[PDB]
Amino acid sequence: SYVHPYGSTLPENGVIGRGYALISDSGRVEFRVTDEGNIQLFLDDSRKLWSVDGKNASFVKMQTDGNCVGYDPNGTAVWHTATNGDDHPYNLVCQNDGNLVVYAKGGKAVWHTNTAVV
């Protein structure tokens, strides 16, 4: 199982490493970085809503530049939301509806998984 250091939300400077995850308030939706180096959004520990698999991800960081980035152990980017901007604060939120969202200031969604299935 995955440890949850952040509840639902990865704020600026937040980092999820292998074995850690965001978890929805409901408990049903989990955004994991796996020991197998995959970045995966799961419903009910059963349904893979969204993933970046096969790239040896070490961690995901919600950066102070607004970009949300997955890195391998060597610091090479393996995934990014391309959300760079100045509309601070930025947050990555794992929602009860299943959607994983990068919000800019004022609750402005600037990237999402498009997986609001609940």
Ligand X SMILES: OC[C@H]1O[C@@H](O)[C@@H](O)[C@@H](O)[C@@H]1O
- Please give the residue ranges that form the binding site for ligand X (CB under 6 A): 63, 65, 67, 69, 77, 80, 84
Task: Give me the least distance between CB of 58 and ligand MAN, in Å please.
Answer: 28
d(CA 91, CA 11) in angstroms, rounded, equals: 5
What H or E segment, with its residue span, contains residue 103? strand 100-104
Q: Give min distance, CB of 36 to ligand X, in A.
A: 22
Q: Which residues contact 33 (CB under 8 A, 6 or more apart)?
A: 16, 17, 18, 19, 20, 21, 39, 57, 58, 59, 60, 70
From a copy of itself, ligand X, ligand MAN, none, interface partner of 51 (C-beta below 5 to 8 A by class): none
Question: Least distance from C-beta 117 to ligand X, angstroms?
Answer: 28
Backbone angles phi, psi at 105, to 5 degrees: -45, 140
| Identity of the residue, 42 or 90, whose beta carbon is nearer to ligand X in the bound complex | 90
* 11 in contact with a copy of itself (CB under 8 A): yes
Q: CA 96 to CA 109: how far, in whole Å?
A: 16
Q: Which does 99 bind (CB under 5 to 8 A by kind): ligand MAN, a copy of itself, ligand X, none?
A: ligand MAN
Q: Does 3 bind a copy of itself (CB under 8 A)?
A: yes
